Design a binder for these strands. Structure first.
Ligand SMILES: [Mn+2]
Ligand SMILES: [Mn+2]
Ligand SMILES: [Mn+2]
Ligand SMILES: [Mn+2]
Length: 177
DNA sequence: GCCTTGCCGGGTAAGTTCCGGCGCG
DNA sequence: CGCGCCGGAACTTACCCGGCAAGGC
């Protein structure tokens, strides 16, 4: 209930600004990574990490939250086969998210990939199918929107939330838990 | 004249996967 | 022997930002 909401939010940040990596090292070593990157140190240590910690505690993951400071950004990383599959399986069943999870995930995805000036309401991603899934959710919530190829340099698509529904958007999705 | 939204270029804030560790049965 | 958790960081580019303008009222 509370776990899955926080889960879908985190999944949003992950699919947005991180990822789920199954790596094969020399040899034959392996690792399973749950990753969120961000520039803001504060956002990652004060906001995201306590949420990942709760989820880790709640699923008995003996793994730790790593925070690696690279040149351009902070990488929050959990190295854990268990947490990995947890999100990956949730991702596999994304089309089945209930209302709480939908709002949670879109919130997460907006923080990552969204227009922060909020003068325009936009979401970027190369994954058209992902954006399409999000678009259908927004329609069932009374938030009109269109999708179209924004950046031909890189095949990045954009999801544009109609300014007509700005307030229904900002207070239903972004101003939640 | 004003509001909404598609267009399009700048470049940095993201993402992705190497490496060397260490530990487990 | 095969595999799973740490600590990095080099490397590439996919996101965001923001000015412009083409319609719609
Ligand atoms: Mn992304
Ligand atoms: Mn991003
Ligand atoms: Mn981002
Ligand atoms: Mn086009």
């Amino acid at each position: 209930e509370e776990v899955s909401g926080i889960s879908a939010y985190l999944l949003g940040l992950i699919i947005g600004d991180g990822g789920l990596y199954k790596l094969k090292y020399k040899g034959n070593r392996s690792e399973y990574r749950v990753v969120i990157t961000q520039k803001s140190e504060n956002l990652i240590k004060q906001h995201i990490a306590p949420l990942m910690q709760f989820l880790i505690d709640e699923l008995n993951v003996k793994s730790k939250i790593q925070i690696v400071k690279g040149d351009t950004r902070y990488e929050l990383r959990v190295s854990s086969k268990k947490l990995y599959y947890y999100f990956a399986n949730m991702l596999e069943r994304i089309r089945l998210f209930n209302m709480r999870e939908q709002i949670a995930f879109i919130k997460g995805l907006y923080v990552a990939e969204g227009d922060k000036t909020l003068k325009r309401l936009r979401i970027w991603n190369k994954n058209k199918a992902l954006l399409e899934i999000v678009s259908r959710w927004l329609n069932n919530l009374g938030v009109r929107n269109t999708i179209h190829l924004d950046d031909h340099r890189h095949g990045v698509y954009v999801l544009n939330i109609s300014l007509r529904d700005r307030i229904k958007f900002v207070h239903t999705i972004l101003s939640s838990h």
